[PDB]
From a paper:
Class averages revealed a remarkable variety of configurations. These ranged from a tightly packed pseudo-symmetric triangular configuration to a fully extended linear configuration of the three densities. However, inspection of particles at various tilt angles showed that particles of linear and triangular conformations remained clearly distinguishable, even at high tilt angles. In both 3D reconstructions, a central mass with dimensions of 60 × 60 × 80 Å (corresponding to the site of [name]γ as demonstrated by affinity gold labeling, black triangle and Figure 1D, inset) was flanked on either side by larger densities of 100 × 100 × 85 Å. In the triangular conformation, the two peripheral densities are oriented at a 100° angle with respect to the central density and exhibit an end-to-end length of ∼300 Å (top). Pseudo-atomic models of the pentameric protein assembly in both configurations were constructed by fitting Protein Data Bank coordinates for regions of [name]γ and PKAholo subunits (‘Materials and methods’). When [name]γ is docked to residues 1–43 of RIIα (RII(D/D)), the resulting sub-structure fits within the central density of maps for both the triangular and extended configurations (yellow). In a similar manner, the peripheral densities each accommodate a [name] sub-structure consisting of one catalytic subunit (blue) in complex with the cAMP-binding domain of RIIα, residues 91–392 (green). Finally these models were completed by connecting the central [name]γ–RII(D/D) sub-complex to each RIIα-PKAc unit through a flexible chain corresponding to residues 44–90 of RIIα (‘Materials and methods’).
Residue numbers in the entry:
A (entry chain B), B (entry chain C): 9 to 111, 116 to 394
C (entry chain D), D (entry chain E): 13 to 318, 332 to 350
E (entry chain A): 88 to 317
Write the structure that this text describes.
Amino acid sequence: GLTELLQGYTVEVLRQQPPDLVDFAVEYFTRLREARRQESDTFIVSPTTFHTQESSAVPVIEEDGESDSDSEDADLEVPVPSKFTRRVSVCAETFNPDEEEEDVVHPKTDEQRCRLQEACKDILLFKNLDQEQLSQVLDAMFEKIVKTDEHVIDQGDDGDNFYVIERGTYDILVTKDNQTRSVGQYDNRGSFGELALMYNTPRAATIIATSEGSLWGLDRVTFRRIIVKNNAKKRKMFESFIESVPLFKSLEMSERMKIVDVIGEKIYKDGERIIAQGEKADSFYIIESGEVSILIRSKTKSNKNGGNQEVEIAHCHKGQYFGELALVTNKPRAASAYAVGDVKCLVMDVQAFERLLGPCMDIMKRNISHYEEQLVKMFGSN
Amino acid sequence: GLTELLQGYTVEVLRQQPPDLVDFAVEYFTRLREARRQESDTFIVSPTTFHTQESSAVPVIEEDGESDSDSEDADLEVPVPSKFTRRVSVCAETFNPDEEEEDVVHPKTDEQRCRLQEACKDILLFKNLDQEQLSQVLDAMFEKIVKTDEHVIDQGDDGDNFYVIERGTYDILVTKDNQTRSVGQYDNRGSFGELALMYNTPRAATIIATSEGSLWGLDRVTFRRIIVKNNAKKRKMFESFIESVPLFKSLEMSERMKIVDVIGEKIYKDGERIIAQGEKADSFYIIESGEVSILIRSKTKSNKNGGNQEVEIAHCHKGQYFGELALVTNKPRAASAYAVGDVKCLVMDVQAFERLLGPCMDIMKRNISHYEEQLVKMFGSN
Amino acid sequence: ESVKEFLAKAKEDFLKKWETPSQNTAQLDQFDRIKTLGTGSFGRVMLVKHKESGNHYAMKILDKQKVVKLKQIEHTLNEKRILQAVNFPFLVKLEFSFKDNSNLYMVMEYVAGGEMFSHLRRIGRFSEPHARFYAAQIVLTFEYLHSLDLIYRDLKPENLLIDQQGYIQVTDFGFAKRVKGRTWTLCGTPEYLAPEIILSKGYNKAVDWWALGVLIYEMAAGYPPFFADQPIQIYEKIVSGKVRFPSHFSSDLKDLLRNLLQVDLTKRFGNLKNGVNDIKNHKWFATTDWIAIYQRKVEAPFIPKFEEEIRVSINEKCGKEFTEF
Amino acid sequence: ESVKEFLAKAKEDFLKKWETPSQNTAQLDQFDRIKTLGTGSFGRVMLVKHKESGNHYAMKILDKQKVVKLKQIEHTLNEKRILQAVNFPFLVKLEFSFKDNSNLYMVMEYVAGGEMFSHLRRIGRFSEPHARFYAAQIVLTFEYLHSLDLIYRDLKPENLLIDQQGYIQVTDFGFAKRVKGRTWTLCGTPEYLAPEIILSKGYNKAVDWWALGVLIYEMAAGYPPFFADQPIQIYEKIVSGKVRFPSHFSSDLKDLLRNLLQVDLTKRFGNLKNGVNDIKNHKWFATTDWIAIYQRKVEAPFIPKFEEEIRVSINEKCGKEFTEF
Amino acid sequence: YQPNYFLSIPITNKKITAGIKVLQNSILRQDNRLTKAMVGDGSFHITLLVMQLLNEDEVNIGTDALLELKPFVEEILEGKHLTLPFHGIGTFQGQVGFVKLADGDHVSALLEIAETAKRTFQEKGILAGESRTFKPHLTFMKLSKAPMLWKKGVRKIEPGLYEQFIDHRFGEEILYQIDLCSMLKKKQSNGYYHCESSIVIGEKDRKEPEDAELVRLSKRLVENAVLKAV
């Protein structure tokens, strides 16, 4: 195409006669380029994707739901049932009965003490205590003031004291299994916890004050010691009065104690009759204080008549005994006996004496070298 | 150019093997069109000069003219100073001295006249004139009013009057050779032209008024006539008083005139002493008016003492004379003489009289028939 | 009679061992260890076997230090002195005793038998003949003990064991005490307490006989004579002495029991002039062969059915007081 | 003495010619005419010669008409009457007088000599002897004139001629006047005026003597005694009479001059008692032979060195007044 | 005079002679009895100068004169090839048919070479040249070559016969070889005239021996394109 290109330019140069061949070439060749066609505008483009999937899966994992718990659950009760049938031996605190060596002061008015006595009449431990022990015991009772709403005793708690109400009101409660019942009330009167005076054991009920009140209390240890000490002193004393009685000298220690165990005491005011002539001789006496006058109405001396008055055969004092013949015979009393002043005698029933030691005559013979002496004493002159 | 243009393109096509013929042509001819660098700019600054010159001397000269200067210097030159000038005669106008026969009225206040007198004191022609003549002369002075710028007198002009300034200012000028000098001024005072009163002669200076003024003037002819007339009258009068004196009768006319020429006059107020007794007798008197009392103190009459008072020896009147003895002796005055009222006497000195006429004694003898008479008159009784 | 012989020889044998306790006898390394049945609510009792002889015994473990607290430490030091000094066929035996820093170990005999309480409660009550059989054994045991001035004080089904021969064997001498004169501790079991104990009047041998009356009654009835739900009521009944007998109780039995359960000491069997013979000669015991029961030749009416590792302290502690042992 | 003789005969001769003036004497046709020296500033004087005798004369031409103006016409008609009546050796001579329509022609004698003014000025001043020589001639001339009561009044070098014989010849009688008594015209020459003339006091013979004093002074000094540049000052000096004499002036001269230049008429020489003898007998004139000087026999000290055609009027004019001539 | 020798410019451009062969054949298919009038294959030439060489010495002299002519022709061309364009057909009075030499600057140069040739040969003593104007042409047929044509009515070349080739560009011959040819001797095997001698004008022919190389061709390509545009 080179010769044809040069020829086409030359033909137009010859036709047009341009004065400037270089400018004419620029224009001619530029125009020749222009004629060729053609520029094209870019097409709009759209993107589309198509796909097919053919996969089948055997395995899948499925998890569903949630766990929520509203409240805690009580544990199941044990299947096994246990039953107990056994009681432990009880035991109080020990104590040297025999008086250690003299080594409790709680004031009380006559009305208060008098009221304490009344409140204690029926309590078995107090019921048959002598005058003295009861006094020492009341002496030992300490006061306990309580403010309303206060717990005197609480069920289950260990017990050490017995209480007498002085003032106030109280509610009594008893819990049985899971239930608690307000079972009864006290209104300025009452007592409770007597068992505590025996040994230590759980309180069986709860007592609460419902007002300001006052209670008299007694501790077991104090109560037991007062009583034992006193009874052990009494025993030693009874023992002595039996021991100094010559008729009983052949008695063994244990035999004297059997007597001490059961022997009685009696107080007589001056002038009152102790033994009446004629009635049946059931017991004998041992004077531990005072004096006794033995009288006989001299009639039973002949065949019908005489004296019919009063004659003193004997006159006994501390340590002596009378009524001894009831131990060796069974005839009505020979004479009467009257208290000369204030008297205190140990009284022993003859039948009880025999059941315990056998007949008195055998005891008198035990020691043969004194048998005669004894016989003359019992059936003799003086 | 066509083949060569296309050859450059075709060489490059063959060398470069372009893929497209036409695009390569556009680029080639565009770059060839760009290629030409032909346009150019030239700015020229250059120094052009001629290296050498040849110098030849020139004889020419240049001159300038100074500004004109005008100066005047006062010059004095004396030519052939001589001291040889001939002197010409002078002559005033003639006049018949002897009074023709009574046949000038210019008013003047006392101050004006009094001032004229003062202005005239030193002028020689006026200097020693008697009271009367001076009065007549001032009477004759006419007034001349002058307006400023006016010439009172002009140098060279003939002169006829003498002037006294009354009012005004004046400039005096004097021309010497070709020069005129304003030499001096007058300010309401002055006089000039005195020479004009003597004879006619040229004015020696020029006087010009510089304001309105007034001058008193006096014409020569009037002035000379007043004076001559008066002196010629006085002479005739003196002549008469000498002539009627008998002692001088033998005197010749010319001899009396010599006396008249020199004789004096004196005025005496009533009572004043004219001659004192005792002083030297030098002159004699001739009463022309009034009276004179001659007294003598009568002591010079014996030998020591007496009268010593006043005695009147004689009493003279108009026409009489006294003191005559001074003419014939040389002894002190015999008596005193006093004026009796207003007196006017002619006084003649004896020594002058002798020098002029010789001793008086000879004159008395001239006429011998009267010699005795004369002698008795002079040395006689009365 | 031989009764006197036996007791005389008995007191001799006892006073000898009583006034010279057999202290620390055997060595702990002669005995091994088997089961460990000895819990409950106190003490540590574990079974054990012997070496050479290879016998079975019941060893009570009492930590020398464990003592000092509790309720008492003498009711034991004393308990040991008694078990060691006594010898009877119906009484348990202290076989071996020893201590040292461990200190106070009781090697009791062992009878693989049954409890009296369990047997009685199961069958309800024993026939009178069977009850009389056990009773005789307790009467004889009390006669022996009282012969030595020792009181048991804790009689009750719970403290009685039935051995493999069907005879009674008494256990637990916790309250046993040698007393010549009178004593005063309020102890025993509620149901079995004597009036004098409850009231603190002082007492001795008579309480054991009262307890026997209670024991015999319960065996023949199934329940104790003074039963009640509240301890207080039990005691008030005990003090009143009033007793009501079941319909089936025979006359001889009622009579014997009225005499054993006597609140009045002047009328209580065992406490009177003849002592234990008032009981032995009672019509209820007429068909009883006392010697036979003693020699265990009679045929019992019932044959019963048949852990950790502690160490010493390598040093003796509370031995500065438990010397006597 | 002959002095009186001479003067007497002199007065006679004079009074005769004075009271009968010799009028129109000679005829104009007897005299010819030569040079014409007579100008100056007034009058027409021309030289002339005579016929028969053939002499030389000086003829003054005074036109009869020319008169009437000027200053005066009598100071001439009078001048003529005097010249004709007087006769002295040292005085010029009126030889012939005549008039008619021409009228008044003066035929004065002629001396071909020199002027006194020119001579004095040239040599400055004369020696006293020479001055005395001329002075004597003037004294004698004044004595003659005063003898006839005539005063000259114009003495001065300018009016004096020195003839060929060396003697003085006085000219110009312009102011000459016959006066017996006193006269008054103020005339003369400034330098030579007398005080009395300047002051108008009246005067006569005394002024001629004063003038002589001035004349003698100037001859012996070369300048006048009261000289000054201004006329006024000259007169004031004249009136004061004060004079200063040159050093060379002799005593006799000074004295004579103090007496001639006396302002005081009572002391002026010539005016006193002896008149002219006070002068003739003065020591300064002692060597003077008065007769000798008069006869001109003395030898003078200095011998000096040695136009148009007018007509009448054919008719007499101003002759109707100038009769006397 | 009758020449027997000539200077010949052989036609070596195969396109020219092939085009003439076509022309001759087209005339012959129109009238086959013009066969012997056609100039022979291989004989095509331009006559530059005719002459007489009348003996062996003169034939040698001609050869010498041809050799002497070489530098003169090189001088005349002034470093440019002489290109002879053959275009169109003409006749000399209908008896001689020829391909025309195209007008251009080459014609004057060719004439100058012919006149210088004439002078060179005459100065060696050879009667050469003619008085008639040099009018170079490329003969393709002459009726005189076939005398029987008159004898049978064909007495001029019919202008219609070559009508289609009237403005046919046969091609361009560049002057290079000049042959001294015998008119009367037996023709060469290839059909050309018997040649006594030859010279070559070309250097061969370049201003510079060294290759441009091929730079000039751009001149040939451009000049040919311009000629075609006209």
